[PDB]
mmCIF file of C-alpha atoms and ligand atoms in Angstrom:
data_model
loop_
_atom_site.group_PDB
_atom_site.id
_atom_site.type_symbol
_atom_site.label_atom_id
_atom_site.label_comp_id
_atom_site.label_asym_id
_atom_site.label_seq_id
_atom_site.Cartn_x
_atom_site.Cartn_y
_atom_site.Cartn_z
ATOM 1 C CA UNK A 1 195.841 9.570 26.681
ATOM 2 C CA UNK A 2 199.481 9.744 26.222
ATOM 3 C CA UNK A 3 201.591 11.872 24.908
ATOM 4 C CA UNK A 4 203.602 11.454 21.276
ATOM 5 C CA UNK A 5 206.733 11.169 23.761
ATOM 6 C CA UNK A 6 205.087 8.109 25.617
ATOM 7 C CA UNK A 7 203.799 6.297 22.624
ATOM 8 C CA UNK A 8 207.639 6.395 21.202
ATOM 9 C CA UNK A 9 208.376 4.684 24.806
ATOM 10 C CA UNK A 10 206.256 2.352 24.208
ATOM 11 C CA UNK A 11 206.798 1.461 20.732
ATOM 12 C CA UNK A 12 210.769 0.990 21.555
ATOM 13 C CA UNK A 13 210.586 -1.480 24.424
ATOM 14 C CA UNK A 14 207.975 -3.272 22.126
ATOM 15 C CA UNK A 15 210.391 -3.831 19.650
ATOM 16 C CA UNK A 16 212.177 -6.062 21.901
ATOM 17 C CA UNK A 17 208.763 -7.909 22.374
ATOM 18 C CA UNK A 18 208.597 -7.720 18.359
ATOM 19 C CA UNK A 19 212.127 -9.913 18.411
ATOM 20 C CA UNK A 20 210.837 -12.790 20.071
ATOM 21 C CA UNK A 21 206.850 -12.452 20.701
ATOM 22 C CA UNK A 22 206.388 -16.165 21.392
ATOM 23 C CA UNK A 23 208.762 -16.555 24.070
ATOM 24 C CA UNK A 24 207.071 -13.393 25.531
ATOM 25 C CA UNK A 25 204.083 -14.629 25.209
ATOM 26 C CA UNK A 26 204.986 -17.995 26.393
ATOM 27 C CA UNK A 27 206.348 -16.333 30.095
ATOM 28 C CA UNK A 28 203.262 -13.603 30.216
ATOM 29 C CA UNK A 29 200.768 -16.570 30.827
ATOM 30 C CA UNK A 30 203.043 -18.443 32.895
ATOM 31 C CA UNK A 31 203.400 -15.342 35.046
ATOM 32 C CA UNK A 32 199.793 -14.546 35.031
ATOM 33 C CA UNK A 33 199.071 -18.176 35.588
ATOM 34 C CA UNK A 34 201.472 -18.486 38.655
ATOM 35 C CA UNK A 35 200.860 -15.303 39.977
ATOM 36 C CA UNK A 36 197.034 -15.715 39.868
ATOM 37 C CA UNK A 37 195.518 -19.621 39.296
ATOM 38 C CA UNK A 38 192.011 -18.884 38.725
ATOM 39 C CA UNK A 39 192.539 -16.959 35.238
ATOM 40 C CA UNK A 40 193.952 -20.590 34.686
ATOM 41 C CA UNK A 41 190.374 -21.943 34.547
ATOM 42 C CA UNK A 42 189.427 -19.793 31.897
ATOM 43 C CA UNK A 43 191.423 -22.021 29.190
ATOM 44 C CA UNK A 44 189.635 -25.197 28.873
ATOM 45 C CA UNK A 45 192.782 -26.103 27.032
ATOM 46 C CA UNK A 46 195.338 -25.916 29.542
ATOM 47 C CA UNK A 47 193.419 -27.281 32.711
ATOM 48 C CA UNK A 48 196.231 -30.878 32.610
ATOM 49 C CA UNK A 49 198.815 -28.361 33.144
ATOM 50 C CA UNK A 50 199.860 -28.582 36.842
ATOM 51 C CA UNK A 51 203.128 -26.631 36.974
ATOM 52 C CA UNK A 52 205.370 -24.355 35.613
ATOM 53 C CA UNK A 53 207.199 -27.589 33.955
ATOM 54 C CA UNK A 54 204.151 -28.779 32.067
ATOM 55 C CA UNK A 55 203.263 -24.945 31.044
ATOM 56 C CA UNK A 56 206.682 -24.809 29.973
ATOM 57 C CA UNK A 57 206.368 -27.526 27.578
ATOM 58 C CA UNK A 58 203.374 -26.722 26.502
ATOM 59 C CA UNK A 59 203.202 -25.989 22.558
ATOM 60 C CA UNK A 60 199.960 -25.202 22.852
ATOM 61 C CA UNK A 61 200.390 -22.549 25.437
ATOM 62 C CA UNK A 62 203.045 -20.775 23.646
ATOM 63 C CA UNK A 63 201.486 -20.951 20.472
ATOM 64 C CA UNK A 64 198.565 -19.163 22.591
ATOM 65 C CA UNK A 65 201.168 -16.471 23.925
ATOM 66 C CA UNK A 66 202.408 -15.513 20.521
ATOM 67 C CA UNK A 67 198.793 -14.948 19.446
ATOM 68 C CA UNK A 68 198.039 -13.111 22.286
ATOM 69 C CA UNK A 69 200.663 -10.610 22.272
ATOM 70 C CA UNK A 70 200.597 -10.120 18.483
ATOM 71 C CA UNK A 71 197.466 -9.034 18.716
ATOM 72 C CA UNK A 72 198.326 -6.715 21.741
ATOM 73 C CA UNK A 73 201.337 -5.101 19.346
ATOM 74 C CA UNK A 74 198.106 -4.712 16.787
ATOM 75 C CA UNK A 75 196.594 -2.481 19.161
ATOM 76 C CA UNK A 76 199.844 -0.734 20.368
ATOM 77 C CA UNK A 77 200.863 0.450 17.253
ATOM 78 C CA UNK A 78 197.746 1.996 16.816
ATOM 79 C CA UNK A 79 199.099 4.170 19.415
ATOM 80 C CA UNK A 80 195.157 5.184 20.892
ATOM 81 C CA UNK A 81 193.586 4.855 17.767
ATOM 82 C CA UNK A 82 192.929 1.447 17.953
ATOM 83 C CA UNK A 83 188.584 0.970 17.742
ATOM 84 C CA UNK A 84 188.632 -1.549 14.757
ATOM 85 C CA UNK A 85 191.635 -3.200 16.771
ATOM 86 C CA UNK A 86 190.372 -3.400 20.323
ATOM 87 C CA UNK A 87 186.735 -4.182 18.970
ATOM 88 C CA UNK A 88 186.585 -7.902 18.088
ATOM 89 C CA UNK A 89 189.065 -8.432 20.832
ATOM 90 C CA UNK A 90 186.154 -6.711 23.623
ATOM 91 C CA UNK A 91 183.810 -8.640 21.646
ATOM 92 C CA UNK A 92 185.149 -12.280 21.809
ATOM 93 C CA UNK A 93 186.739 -11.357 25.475
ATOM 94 C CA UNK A 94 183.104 -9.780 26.701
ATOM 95 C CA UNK A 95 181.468 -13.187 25.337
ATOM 96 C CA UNK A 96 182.839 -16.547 24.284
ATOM 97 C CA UNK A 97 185.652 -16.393 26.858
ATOM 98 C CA UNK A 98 184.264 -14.726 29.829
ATOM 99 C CA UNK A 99 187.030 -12.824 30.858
ATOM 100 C CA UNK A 100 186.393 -10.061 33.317
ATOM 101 C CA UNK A 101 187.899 -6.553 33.453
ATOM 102 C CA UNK A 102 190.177 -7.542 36.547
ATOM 103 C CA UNK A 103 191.753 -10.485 34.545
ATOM 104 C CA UNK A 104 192.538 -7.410 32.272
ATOM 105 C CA UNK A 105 194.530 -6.117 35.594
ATOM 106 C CA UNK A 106 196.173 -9.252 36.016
ATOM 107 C CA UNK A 107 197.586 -9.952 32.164
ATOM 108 C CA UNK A 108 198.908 -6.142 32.244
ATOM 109 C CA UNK A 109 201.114 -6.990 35.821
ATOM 110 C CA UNK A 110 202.544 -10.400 33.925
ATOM 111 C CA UNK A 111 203.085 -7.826 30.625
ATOM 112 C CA UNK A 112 204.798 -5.432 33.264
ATOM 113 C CA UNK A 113 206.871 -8.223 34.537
ATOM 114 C CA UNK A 114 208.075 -10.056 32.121
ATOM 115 C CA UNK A 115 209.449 -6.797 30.442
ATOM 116 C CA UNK A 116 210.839 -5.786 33.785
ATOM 117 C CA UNK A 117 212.660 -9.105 33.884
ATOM 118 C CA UNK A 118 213.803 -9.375 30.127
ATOM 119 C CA UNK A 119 214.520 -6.043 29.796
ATOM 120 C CA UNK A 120 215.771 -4.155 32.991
ATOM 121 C CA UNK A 121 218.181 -2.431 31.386
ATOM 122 C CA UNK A 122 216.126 -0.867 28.461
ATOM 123 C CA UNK A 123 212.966 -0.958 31.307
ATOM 124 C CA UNK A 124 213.658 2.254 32.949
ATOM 125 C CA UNK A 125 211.251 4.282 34.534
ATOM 126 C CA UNK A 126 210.435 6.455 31.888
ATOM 127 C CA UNK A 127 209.622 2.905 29.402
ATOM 128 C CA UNK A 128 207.361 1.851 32.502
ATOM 129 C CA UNK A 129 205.257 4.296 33.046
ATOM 130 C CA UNK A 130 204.967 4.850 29.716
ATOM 131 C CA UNK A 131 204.087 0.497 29.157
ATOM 132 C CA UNK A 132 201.558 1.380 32.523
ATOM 133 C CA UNK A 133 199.285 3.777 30.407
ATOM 134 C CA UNK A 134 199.125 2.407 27.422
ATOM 135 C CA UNK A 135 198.065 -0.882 29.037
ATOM 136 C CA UNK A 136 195.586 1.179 31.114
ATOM 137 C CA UNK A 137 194.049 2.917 27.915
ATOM 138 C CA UNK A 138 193.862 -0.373 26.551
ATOM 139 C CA UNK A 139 192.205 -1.699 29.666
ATOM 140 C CA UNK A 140 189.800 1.178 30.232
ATOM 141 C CA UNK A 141 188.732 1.202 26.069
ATOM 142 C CA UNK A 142 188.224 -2.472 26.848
ATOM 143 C CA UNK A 143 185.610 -1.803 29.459
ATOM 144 C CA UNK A 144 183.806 0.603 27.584
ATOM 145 C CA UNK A 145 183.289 -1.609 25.197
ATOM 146 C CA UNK A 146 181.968 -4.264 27.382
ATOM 147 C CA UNK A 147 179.819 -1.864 28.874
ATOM 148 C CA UNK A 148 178.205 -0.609 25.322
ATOM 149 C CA UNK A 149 178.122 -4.629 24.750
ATOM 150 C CA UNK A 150 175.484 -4.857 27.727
ATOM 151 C CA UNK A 151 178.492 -6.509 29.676
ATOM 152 C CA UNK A 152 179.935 -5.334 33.797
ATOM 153 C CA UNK A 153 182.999 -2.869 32.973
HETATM 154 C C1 HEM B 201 196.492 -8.299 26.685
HETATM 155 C C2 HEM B 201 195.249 -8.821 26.879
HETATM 156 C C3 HEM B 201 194.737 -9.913 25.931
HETATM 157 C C4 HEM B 201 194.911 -10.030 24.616
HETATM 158 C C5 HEM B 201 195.613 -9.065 23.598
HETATM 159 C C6 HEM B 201 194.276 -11.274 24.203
HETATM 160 C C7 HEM B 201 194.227 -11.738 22.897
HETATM 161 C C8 HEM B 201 193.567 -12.857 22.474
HETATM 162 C C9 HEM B 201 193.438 -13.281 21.085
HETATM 163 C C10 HEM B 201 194.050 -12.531 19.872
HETATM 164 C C11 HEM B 201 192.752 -14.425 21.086
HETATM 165 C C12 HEM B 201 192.362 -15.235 19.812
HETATM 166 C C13 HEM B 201 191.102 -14.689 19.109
HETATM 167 C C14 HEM B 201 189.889 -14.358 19.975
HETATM 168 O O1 HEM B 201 189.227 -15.295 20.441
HETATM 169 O O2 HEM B 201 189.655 -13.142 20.169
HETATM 170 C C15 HEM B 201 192.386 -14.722 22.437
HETATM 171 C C16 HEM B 201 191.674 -15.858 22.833
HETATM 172 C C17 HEM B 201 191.438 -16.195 24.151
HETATM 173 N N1 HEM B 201 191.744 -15.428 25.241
HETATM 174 FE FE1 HEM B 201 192.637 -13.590 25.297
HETATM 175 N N2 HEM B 201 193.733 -11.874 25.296
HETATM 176 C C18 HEM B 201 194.005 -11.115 26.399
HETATM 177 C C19 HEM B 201 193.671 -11.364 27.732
HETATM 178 C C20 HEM B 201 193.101 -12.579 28.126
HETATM 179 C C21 HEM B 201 192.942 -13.020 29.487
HETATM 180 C C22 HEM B 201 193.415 -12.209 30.712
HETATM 181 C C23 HEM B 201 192.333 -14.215 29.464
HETATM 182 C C24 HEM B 201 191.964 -15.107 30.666
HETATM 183 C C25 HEM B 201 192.221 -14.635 31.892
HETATM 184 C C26 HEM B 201 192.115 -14.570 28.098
HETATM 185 C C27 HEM B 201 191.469 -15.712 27.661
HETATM 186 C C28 HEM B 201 191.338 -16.129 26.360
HETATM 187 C C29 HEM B 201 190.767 -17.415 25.944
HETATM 188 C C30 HEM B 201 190.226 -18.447 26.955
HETATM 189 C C31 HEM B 201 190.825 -17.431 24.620
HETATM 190 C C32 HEM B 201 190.409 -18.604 23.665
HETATM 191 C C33 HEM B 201 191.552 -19.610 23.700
HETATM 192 C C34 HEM B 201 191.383 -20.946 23.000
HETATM 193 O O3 HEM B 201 191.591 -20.965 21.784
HETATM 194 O O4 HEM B 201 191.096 -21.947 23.697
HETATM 195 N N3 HEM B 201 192.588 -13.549 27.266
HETATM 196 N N4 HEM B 201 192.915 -13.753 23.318
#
């Protein structure tokens, strides 16, 4: 639902993601995390963390981040056409990890975040709003596939 102008937004300030995804990916779940501890109880592997130190160290968490947001950049790049993409992901999301739509909400604010604080200076608010709908889309396509799945969107 954006326009050609937004996608080339979006596809810049991922290029800075696309220079160091792990570390990214590493401060995206320690945000989300953080900011909201029940989405914490959703990874039966990092339960024993119990603060930002231990997350930190983590290799296991970061190795989690990386795959994470390259699969994200999968989907971005497909700029909106991204059904074979975003399927599987809907699929394993919708049933082996039992993630609801709102977590959805809550990994898009850490996205937001972290770029806002890695990036400020190539984060203006053009790149934002831009970042805000294609995270949207992706959230939105996300819950109509849960929905077609028999799953609450
Ligand atoms: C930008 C949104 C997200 C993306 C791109 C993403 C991506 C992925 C990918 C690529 C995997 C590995 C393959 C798979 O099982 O599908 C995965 C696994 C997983 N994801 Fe997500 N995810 C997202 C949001 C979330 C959120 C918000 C949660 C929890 C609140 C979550 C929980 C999990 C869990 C528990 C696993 C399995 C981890 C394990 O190996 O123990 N994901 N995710």
């Amino acid at each position: 639902g954006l326009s050609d102008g937004e996608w080339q937004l979006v596809l810049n300030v991922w290029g800075k993601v696309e220079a160091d995804v792990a570390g990214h990916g590493q401060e995206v779940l320690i945000r989300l995390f953080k900011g909201h501890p029940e989405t914490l109880e959703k990874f039966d592997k990092f339960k024993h963390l119990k603060s930002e130190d231990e997350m930190k160290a983590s290799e296991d968490l970061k190795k989690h981040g990386n795959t994470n947001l390259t699969a994200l950049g999968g989907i971005l790049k497909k700029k909106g056409h991204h059904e074979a993409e975003l399927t599987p992901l809907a699929q394993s999301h919708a049933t082996k990890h039992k993630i609801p739509v709102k977590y959805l909400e809550f990994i898009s604010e850490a996205i937001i975040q972290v770029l806002q604080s890695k990036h400020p200076g190539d984060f203006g608010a053009d790149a934002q709003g831009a970042m805000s709908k294609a995270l949207e889309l992706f959230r939105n396509d996300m819950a109509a596939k849960y929905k077609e799945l028999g799953f609450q969107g």
